[PDB]
CSV table of C-alpha atoms in Angstrom, one decimal:
chain,number,residue,atom,x,y,z
A,2,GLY,CA,16.1,29.8,-23.7
A,3,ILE,CA,14.5,33.1,-24.1
A,4,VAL,CA,13.8,32.1,-27.8
A,5,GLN,CA,11.7,29.1,-26.7
A,6,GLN,CA,9.9,31.3,-24.2
A,7,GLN,CA,9.1,33.9,-26.8
A,8,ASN,CA,7.6,31.0,-28.8
A,9,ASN,CA,5.3,30.2,-25.9
A,10,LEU,CA,4.5,33.9,-25.7
A,11,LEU,CA,3.6,34.0,-29.4
A,12,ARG,CA,1.6,30.8,-29.1
A,13,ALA,CA,-0.3,32.1,-26.1
A,14,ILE,CA,-1.1,35.3,-28.0
A,15,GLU,CA,-2.6,33.1,-30.8
A,16,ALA,CA,-4.8,31.1,-28.5
A,17,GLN,CA,-6.0,34.4,-26.9
A,18,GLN,CA,-6.7,35.6,-30.4
A,19,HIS,CA,-9.0,32.7,-31.1
A,20,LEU,CA,-10.6,33.1,-27.7
A,21,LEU,CA,-11.2,36.7,-28.7
A,22,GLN,CA,-12.9,35.9,-32.0
A,23,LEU,CA,-15.1,33.5,-30.0
A,24,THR,CA,-16.3,36.5,-28.0
A,25,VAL,CA,-16.8,38.7,-31.0
A,26,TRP,CA,-18.9,35.9,-32.4
A,27,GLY,CA,-20.6,35.9,-29.0
A,28,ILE,CA,-21.3,39.6,-29.0
A,29,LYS,CA,-22.4,39.6,-32.6
A,30,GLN,CA,-25.2,37.1,-31.8
A,31,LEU,CA,-26.5,39.2,-28.8
A,32,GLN,CA,-26.1,42.4,-30.8
A,33,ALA,CA,-28.5,41.0,-33.5
A,34,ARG,CA,-31.2,40.3,-30.9
A,35,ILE,CA,-30.9,43.5,-28.9
A,36,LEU,CA,-30.1,46.0,-31.7
A,37,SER,CA,-31.6,47.9,-34.6
A,38,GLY,CA,-28.5,48.3,-36.8
A,39,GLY,CA,-25.0,49.9,-36.8
A,40,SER,CA,-26.7,53.0,-35.4
A,41,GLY,CA,-25.2,54.5,-32.2
A,42,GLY,CA,-21.7,53.1,-32.6
A,43,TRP,CA,-22.1,49.6,-34.0
A,44,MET,CA,-21.0,49.7,-37.7
A,45,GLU,CA,-17.8,51.4,-36.5
A,46,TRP,CA,-17.2,48.7,-33.9
A,47,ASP,CA,-17.9,46.2,-36.6
A,48,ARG,CA,-15.4,47.9,-39.0
A,49,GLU,CA,-12.8,48.3,-36.2
A,50,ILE,CA,-13.0,44.8,-35.0
A,51,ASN,CA,-11.9,43.9,-38.6
A,52,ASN,CA,-9.2,46.6,-39.0
A,53,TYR,CA,-7.7,45.3,-35.7
A,54,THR,CA,-8.2,41.5,-36.4
A,55,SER,CA,-6.4,41.9,-39.7
A,56,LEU,CA,-3.6,43.9,-38.2
A,57,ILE,CA,-3.2,41.3,-35.5
A,58,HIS,CA,-3.2,38.4,-38.0
A,59,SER,CA,-0.4,40.2,-39.8
A,60,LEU,CA,1.4,40.7,-36.5
A,61,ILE,CA,1.3,37.0,-35.6
A,62,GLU,CA,2.5,36.4,-39.0
A,63,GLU,CA,5.5,38.6,-38.7
A,64,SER,CA,6.2,37.1,-35.3
A,65,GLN,CA,6.1,33.5,-36.6
A,66,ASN,CA,8.7,34.4,-39.1
A,67,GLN,CA,11.0,36.2,-36.7
A,68,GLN,CA,10.6,33.1,-34.6
A,69,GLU,CA,11.7,30.6,-37.2
A,70,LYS,CA,14.6,32.9,-38.0
A,71,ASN,CA,15.6,33.2,-34.3
A,72,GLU,CA,15.5,29.4,-34.0
A,73,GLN,CA,17.7,29.0,-37.1
A,74,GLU,CA,20.3,31.1,-35.4
A,75,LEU,CA,20.5,29.6,-31.9
A,76,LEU,CA,24.0,28.2,-32.8
A,77,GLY,CA,25.3,31.5,-34.3
A,78,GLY,CA,25.1,33.1,-30.8
A,79,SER,CA,25.2,36.8,-31.8
A,80,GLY,CA,21.4,37.3,-32.3
A,81,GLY,CA,20.6,39.8,-29.5
A,82,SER,CA,19.0,42.0,-32.1
A,83,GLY,CA,16.6,39.2,-33.3
A,84,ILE,CA,15.4,38.5,-29.8
A,85,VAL,CA,14.9,42.2,-29.2
A,86,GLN,CA,13.0,42.4,-32.5
A,87,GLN,CA,10.9,39.5,-31.4
A,88,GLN,CA,10.2,41.2,-28.2
A,89,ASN,CA,9.1,44.3,-30.2
A,90,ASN,CA,6.9,42.2,-32.2
A,91,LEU,CA,5.1,40.6,-29.2
A,92,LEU,CA,4.6,44.0,-27.7
A,93,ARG,CA,2.9,45.3,-30.9
A,94,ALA,CA,0.7,42.1,-30.9
A,95,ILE,CA,-0.3,42.6,-27.3
A,96,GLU,CA,-1.4,46.2,-27.8
A,97,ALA,CA,-3.5,45.3,-30.8
A,98,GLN,CA,-5.1,42.6,-28.8
A,99,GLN,CA,-5.8,45.2,-26.2
A,100,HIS,CA,-7.6,47.5,-28.6
A,101,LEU,CA,-9.7,44.4,-29.4
A,102,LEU,CA,-10.4,43.6,-25.8
A,103,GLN,CA,-11.4,47.2,-25.4
A,104,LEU,CA,-13.9,47.0,-28.3
A,105,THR,CA,-15.5,43.8,-26.9
A,106,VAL,CA,-15.7,45.3,-23.4
A,107,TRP,CA,-17.4,48.3,-25.0
A,108,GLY,CA,-19.6,46.0,-26.9
A,109,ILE,CA,-20.8,44.2,-23.8
A,110,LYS,CA,-21.1,47.5,-21.9
A,111,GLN,CA,-23.5,48.7,-24.5
A,112,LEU,CA,-25.6,45.6,-24.5
A,113,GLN,CA,-25.8,45.1,-20.8
A,114,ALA,CA,-26.9,48.8,-20.4
A,115,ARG,CA,-30.1,48.1,-22.3
A,116,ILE,CA,-31.3,44.8,-20.7
A,117,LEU,CA,-29.8,44.5,-17.2
A,118,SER,CA,-29.3,46.6,-14.1
A,119,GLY,CA,-25.5,47.2,-13.8
A,120,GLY,CA,-25.9,47.0,-10.0
A,121,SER,CA,-27.2,43.4,-10.0
A,122,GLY,CA,-25.9,39.8,-10.3
A,123,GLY,CA,-22.2,40.5,-10.2
A,124,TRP,CA,-22.0,43.6,-12.6
A,125,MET,CA,-20.6,46.1,-10.1
A,126,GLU,CA,-17.7,43.8,-9.4
A,127,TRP,CA,-17.4,43.2,-13.1
A,128,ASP,CA,-17.0,47.0,-13.8
A,129,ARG,CA,-14.3,47.4,-11.2
A,130,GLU,CA,-12.5,44.3,-12.3
A,131,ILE,CA,-12.6,45.3,-15.9
A,132,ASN,CA,-11.5,48.8,-15.0
A,133,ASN,CA,-8.6,47.6,-12.8
A,134,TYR,CA,-7.2,45.1,-15.3
A,135,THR,CA,-7.5,47.7,-18.0
A,136,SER,CA,-5.3,50.2,-15.9
A,137,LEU,CA,-3.0,47.3,-15.0
A,138,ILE,CA,-2.3,46.3,-18.6
A,139,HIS,CA,-2.0,49.9,-19.8
A,140,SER,CA,0.8,50.2,-17.2
A,141,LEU,CA,2.5,46.9,-18.3
A,142,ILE,CA,2.3,48.1,-21.9
A,143,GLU,CA,3.7,51.5,-21.0
A,144,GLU,CA,6.5,49.8,-19.1
A,145,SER,CA,7.1,47.4,-22.0
A,146,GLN,CA,7.4,50.3,-24.5
A,147,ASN,CA,9.9,51.9,-22.1
A,148,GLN,CA,11.8,48.6,-21.8
A,149,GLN,CA,12.0,48.0,-25.5
A,150,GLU,CA,13.4,51.5,-26.2
A,151,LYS,CA,16.1,50.9,-23.6
A,152,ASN,CA,17.0,47.4,-24.6
A,153,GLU,CA,17.4,48.7,-28.2
A,154,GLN,CA,20.2,50.9,-27.0
A,155,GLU,CA,21.7,48.6,-24.5
A,156,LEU,CA,22.2,46.3,-27.4
A,157,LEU,CA,24.7,48.6,-29.1
A,158,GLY,CA,27.3,48.5,-26.4
A,159,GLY,CA,28.2,45.7,-23.9
A,160,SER,CA,25.5,43.3,-22.6
A,161,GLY,CA,22.0,44.4,-21.6
A,162,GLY,CA,20.9,40.8,-21.0
A,163,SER,CA,19.1,41.6,-17.8
A,164,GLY,CA,16.8,44.0,-19.7
A,165,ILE,CA,15.8,41.3,-22.2
A,166,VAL,CA,15.0,39.0,-19.3
A,167,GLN,CA,13.1,41.8,-17.6
A,168,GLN,CA,11.2,42.6,-20.7
A,169,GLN,CA,10.2,38.9,-21.1
A,170,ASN,CA,8.6,39.3,-17.6
A,171,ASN,CA,6.8,42.4,-18.8
A,172,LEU,CA,5.3,40.8,-21.8
A,173,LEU,CA,4.5,37.7,-19.8
A,174,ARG,CA,2.5,39.7,-17.2
A,175,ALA,CA,0.6,41.7,-19.8
A,176,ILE,CA,-0.6,38.5,-21.3
A,177,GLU,CA,-1.8,37.0,-17.9
A,178,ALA,CA,-3.7,40.3,-17.5
A,179,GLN,CA,-5.3,40.2,-20.9
A,180,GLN,CA,-6.2,36.6,-20.0
A,181,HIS,CA,-8.2,37.8,-16.9
A,182,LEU,CA,-9.7,40.5,-19.1
A,183,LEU,CA,-10.8,37.8,-21.4
A,184,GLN,CA,-12.3,35.7,-18.6
A,185,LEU,CA,-14.3,38.8,-17.5
A,186,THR,CA,-15.7,39.3,-21.0
A,187,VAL,CA,-16.6,35.6,-21.2
A,188,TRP,CA,-18.5,36.1,-17.9
A,189,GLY,CA,-20.4,39.2,-19.2
A,190,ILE,CA,-21.5,37.6,-22.5
A,191,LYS,CA,-22.5,34.4,-20.5
A,192,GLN,CA,-24.8,36.7,-18.4
A,193,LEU,CA,-26.2,38.4,-21.4
A,194,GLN,CA,-26.8,35.1,-23.3
A,195,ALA,CA,-28.5,33.7,-20.2
A,196,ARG,CA,-30.9,36.7,-19.9
A,197,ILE,CA,-31.9,37.3,-23.5
A,198,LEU,CA,-31.3,34.0,-25.4
B,2,UNK,CA,-26.3,23.6,-27.3
B,3,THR,CA,-23.8,25.9,-30.4
B,4,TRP,CA,-23.5,27.9,-27.1
B,5,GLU,CA,-22.5,24.8,-25.0
B,6,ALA,CA,-20.1,23.2,-27.4
B,7,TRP,CA,-18.9,27.7,-27.7
B,8,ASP,CA,-18.8,27.4,-23.9
B,9,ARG,CA,-16.4,23.6,-24.9
B,10,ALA,CA,-14.0,25.7,-27.0
B,11,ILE,CA,-13.5,28.7,-24.7
B,12,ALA,CA,-13.0,26.7,-21.4
B,13,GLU,CA,-10.9,24.1,-23.2
B,14,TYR,CA,-8.5,27.5,-25.2
B,15,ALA,CA,-8.6,28.8,-21.7
B,16,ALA,CA,-7.3,25.6,-20.1
B,17,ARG,CA,-4.1,25.7,-23.6
B,18,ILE,CA,-3.4,29.1,-22.3
B,19,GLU,CA,-3.0,28.6,-18.5
B,20,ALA,CA,-0.9,25.4,-18.7
B,21,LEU,CA,1.6,28.0,-21.9
B,22,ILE,CA,1.5,30.8,-19.1
B,23,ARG,CA,2.5,27.1,-16.7
B,24,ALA,CA,5.5,26.9,-19.0
B,25,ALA,CA,6.3,30.7,-19.4
B,26,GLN,CA,6.4,31.4,-15.6
B,27,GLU,CA,8.0,28.1,-14.6
B,28,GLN,CA,11.0,29.5,-17.9
B,29,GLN,CA,10.8,32.9,-16.3
B,30,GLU,CA,11.5,31.7,-12.7
B,31,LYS,CA,15.2,29.7,-15.1
B,32,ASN,CA,15.6,33.3,-16.2
B,33,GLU,CA,15.8,34.9,-12.8
B,34,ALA,CA,18.5,32.2,-12.0
B,35,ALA,CA,20.8,34.9,-14.8
B,36,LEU,CA,19.4,37.8,-12.7
């Protein structure tokens, strides 16, 4: 069932969302030690972490509802549009999560620049890895946006069931890629915490 | 020692997420049996 899958996709996004808050908590601690206020980018980061967390909370919340609704209709077997809506949802949630990764990455980049050499202890690989995964996810998001649009029209006429299945794959791979991204931001914070705390 | 039982939570969300992405791939690879 694509519906059950989408539930796992939702659920995964939630876990990633907690994981993410853990890193913001992480970066906030370091930021306090290394830094003399919201000067030079930081109050905006602070404010934008929030403006995105809140948008994502609200997105998980809309997804959880589309989910229950999809589940209630598994025996009515007409609900192509609900599944496609759920896909739209998950896409929107993935991107916002991305914005959030991007802020944390920036956070760490700022902090590392002040206290470590970016050519030492695994930081060159880290940059490249970060940078690749970023470009990879951007590509998967782009492709997902492209796939959504298409599905949404395939759904008018006869079946476009392959494109739903395809899209599931799209979303699935963007989440694995954010998950790497996450691992890399955990690594970075772990290095900074080691050095300065 | 907040940082070790932080380090606890992350490694043990990280190990939820892998074994969901587990399920999602091992549904995906049912889906390619439509395709």
